[PDB]
């Protein structure tokens, strides 16, 4: 039994400096939710996010690769700073969690052995890495006052000579300098107050390569301008004034205002230097990137590209690449010139997932207010199988202004979705997508590379067929009969009147009276019997019910039930394949997973067969449509994000495996579903979690 992660769809965080790229390994690590996602852009078989670094207990607000080292720094909502170290090459292990701060970490710049940490305490401290150990220790901590850090840059002039540009709630740019003793810091002091800005400095960046050589320092503010300061070392002979000072009885330094670049109209957002050339990258408020360089000798814009959260500047193989994370949490690539393929993912907790009736693609609805379709492309535009069948977002059915709560596929060409809206709509697979899905995913229908972010959010939206009214609350769940002629719906409720089950027709999209009452709270799961003559319901009111189907009028009636199957909310339920038997299992907050089976012997009713308990609540349970050996296959998810694979036979659970902690989500498994399809001798598992990440595993 070999469990292999197939794909990870996570979205970047909305925060300054939440992403960084490794200058050497060319690995971009961005904070996605409470995890640090890793992705290799430059790659043969476009794969995308290949790992989610778990550790932080809050949203990651900053990620930085310490240059010239195997280290990386981080910071989260919980004022914590973590230090990772590359275990192998494309992976990192957390080796230290700094608890010291009780306020937000507003700034963070770190060189090989140091880490400047600006905090909302109004204090900026410098951590210095130990000599024998690998952990950092507070070498020094100070403050300017009224003054608060917003950003700071750390630089290395000479061997033990260091500079630190501090910018914050002060129109000025302070320049602290300290020497590096073997036990930390020595002679630290603010040695220069650079005047020039007419507002708060919110950006700083040093450019120090091959000195004696262009040693610049740029800085932005709450304006539409950027200032560049020239730095001379030992030979530095109205505003042509210099700020001289010296490190020790051996160094002299002279800063000076060189030029002001940003346009009057263009308001700047992000700014960073190039990895090797003397070029500055500045991204405007509106989606537009600009590159600046000298020569004359005046700084000028040498590259513009119109129509940000993050913006990475990197060059590989005599080509320049621009990675730009948008609002939809999607990264896009550009070379210099074409638009290479990027990566997609949610920006808010995922709520539901549902494979196409046949299982070639997987729809995913999240709180991002978007519904995405993920599929694997195993075909070049030439029609031959790709080496590795990678997963991508082939279409974004919608981006409505309603929080996507749930979805279920009616047909490979149509589906239904619901959100924090009163009604729910159905959607039809457009011509544009179908072709795309037929060409790369390979699926026949009746009547040269995946979608870049541009044609994925604008040209690939599914046209709505019909809306359905009835519920006076956001729809929580729903299922489609095996015959696809029915839809069982259920809204959010606190009483019995709204905790009603509505049955809709997929032909006339009209409701089919009468509604179904019983549950006193809100239903969490609705499943139709494999045969289709039954409907099951679990309703976080600690009970379940089975509604028999009248094959004539298609009206349902209550037959079986159980007022106390669980001591706490039931989160999920599922039916085993007919061959196994008239069985269905429920997953509950009471930590247990119970199995039920029809018994007409002592009296007609669905009796309890087996039951197992876990450590955390079981929020997701899905059983495979086919029978593995002569036994059934079940998957279980928890509030931990942990996933258990079980085997089941008349009264005996067999643990196949517990997905390594390194390959599973970081929070509540909102939904788990097996794909109906088997391809390349593998089974597929869809996993939507509360850590805003859609994932896909495979069982060999």
From Swiss-Prot:
CDD domains in the cross-refs: WD40
Pathway(s) served: tRNA modification; 5-methoxycarbonylmethyl-2-thiouridine-tRNA biosynthesis
Compartment annotation: Cytoplasm; Nucleus
Record carries keyword RNA-binding: no
SMART domains, per the entry: WD40
InterPro entries linked to this entry: Elp2, WD40/YVTN_repeat-like_dom_sf, WD40_repeat_dom_sf, WD40_rpt
Statement: the UniProt record of this protein carries the keyword Transport: yes
GO cellular component, one term: cytoplasm
Molecular function as annotated in GO: microtubule binding
Oligomer and partners: Component of the elongator complex which consists of ELP1/IKI3, ELP2, ELP3, ELP4, ELP5/IKI1 and ELP6. The elongator complex is composed of two copies of the Elp123 subcomplex (composed of ELP1/IKI3, ELP2 and ELP3) and two copies of the Elp456 subcomplex (composed of ELP4, ELP5/IKI1 and ELP6). The Elp123 subcomplex forms a two-lobed scaffold, which binds the Elp456 subcomplex asymmetrically. In the complex, ELP2 interacts with ELP1/IKI3. In each lobe, ELP2 is tightly sandwiched between ELP1/IKI3 and ELP3.
Note: Present with 6090 molecules/cell in log phase SD medium.
Similarity-based family: Belongs to the WD repeat ELP2 family.
Name of the protein in its database record: Elongator complex protein 2
The organism of origin for this protein: Saccharomyces cerevisiae (strain ATCC 204508 / S288c)
């Amino acid at each position: 039994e070999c469990i292999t992660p197939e794909a990870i769809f996570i979205g970047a965080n909305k925060q300054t400096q939440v992403s960084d790229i490794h200058k050497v390994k060319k690995i971009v690590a961005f904070g996605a939710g409470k995890t640090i996602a890793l992705w290799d852009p430059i790659e043969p078989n476009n794969k995308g996010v290949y790992a989610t670094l778990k550790g932080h207990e809050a949203e990651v607000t900053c990620v930085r690769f310490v240059p010239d080292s195997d280290f990386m720094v981080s910071a989260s909502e919980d004022h914590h700073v973590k230090i990772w170290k590359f275990t192998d090459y494309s992976h990192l292990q957390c080796i230290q969690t700094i608890q010291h701060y009780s306020k937000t970490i507003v700034a963070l710049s770190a060189l090989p052995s140091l880490i400047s940490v600006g905090c909302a305490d109004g204090t900026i401290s410098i951590w210095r890495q130990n000599i024998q150990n690998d952990e950092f220790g507070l070498a020094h901590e100070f403050t300017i006052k009224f003054f608060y850090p917003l950003c700071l840059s750390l630089s290395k002039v000479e061997e033990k000579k260091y500079l630190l540009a501090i910018g914050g709630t002060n129109v000025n740019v302070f320049i602290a300098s300290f020497i590096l003793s073997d036990s930390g810091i020595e002679k630290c002091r603010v040695v220069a107050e650079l005047e020039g800005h007419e507002d708060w400095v919110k950006s700083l960046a040093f450019r120090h390569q091959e000195t004696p050589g262009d040693y610049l320092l740029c800085s932005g503010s709450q304006d539409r301008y950027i200032r560049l300061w020239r730095i001379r070392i030992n030979d530095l002979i109205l505003s042509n004034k210099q700020y001289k000072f010296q490190i020790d009885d051996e160094l002299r330094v002279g800063i000076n205002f060189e030029a002001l670049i940003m346009g009057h109209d263009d308001w700047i957002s992000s700014l960073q230097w190039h990895e090797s050339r003397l070029q500055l990258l500045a991204a405007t408020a509106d989606t537009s990137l600009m590159v600046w360089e000298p020569d004359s000798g005046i700084w000028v814009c040498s590259l513009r590209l119109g129509e940000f959260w993050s913006c990475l500047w990197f060059t590989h193989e005599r080509m320049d690449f621009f990675l730009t994370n948008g609002k939809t949490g999607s990264w896009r690539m550009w070379a210099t010139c074409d638009q290479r393929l990027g990566i997609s993912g949610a920006t808010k907790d995922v709520t539901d997932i549902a494979w196409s009736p046949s299982g070639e693609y997987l729809l995913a609805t999240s709180l991002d207010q978007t519904t995405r379709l993920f599929a694997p492309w195993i075909y070049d535009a030439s029609g031959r199988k790709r080496e590795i069948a990678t997963w991508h977002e082939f279409s974004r059915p919608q981006i409505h202004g309603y929080d996507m709560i749930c979805v279920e596929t009616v047909t490979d060409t149509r589906f239904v979705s619901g959100g924090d809206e009163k009604i729910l709509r159905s959607f039809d697979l457009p011509k544009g997508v179908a072709g795309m899905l037929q060409k790369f995913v390979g699926i026949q229908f009746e009547e040269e590379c995946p979608p870049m972010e541009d044609q994925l959010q604008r040209h690939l939206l599914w046209p709505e067929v019909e809306k359905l009214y009835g519920h006076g609350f956001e729809i929580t769940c729903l299922d489609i009969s095996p015959d696809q002629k029915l839809i069982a719906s259920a809204c959010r409720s606190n009483n019995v009147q709204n905790a009603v089950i509505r049955i809709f027709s997929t032909e006339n999209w009209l409701e089919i009276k009468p509604a179904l009452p019983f549950h006193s709270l809100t239903i969490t799961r609705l499943k139709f019997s494999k045969d289709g003559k039954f409907l099951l319901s679990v309703c976080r009111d600690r009970k379940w019910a089975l509604w028999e189907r009248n094959m004539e009028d298609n009206t349902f009636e209550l037959r079986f039930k159980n007022e106390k199957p669980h001591t706490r909310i039931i989160w999920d339920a599922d039916w085993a394949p007919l061959e196994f038997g008239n069985v269905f299992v429920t997953a509950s907050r009471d930590k247990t997973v119970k199995v039920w089976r029809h018994q007409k012997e002592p009296a007609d009713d669905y009796v309890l067969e087996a039951s197992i308990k876990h450590t955390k609540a079981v929020t997701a349970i899905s059983i495979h449509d086919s029978m593995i050996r002569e036994k059934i296959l079940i998957s279980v998810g928890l509030e931990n994000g942990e996933i258990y694979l079980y085997s089941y036979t008349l009264g005996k659970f067999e643990l196949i495996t517990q997905l390594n902690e390194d390959i599973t989500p970081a929070d509540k498994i909102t939904r788990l579903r097996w794909s109906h399809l088997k391809r390349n001798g593998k089974l597929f598992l869809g996993v939507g979690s509360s850590d805003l990440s859609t994932r896909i595993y495979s069982l060999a």
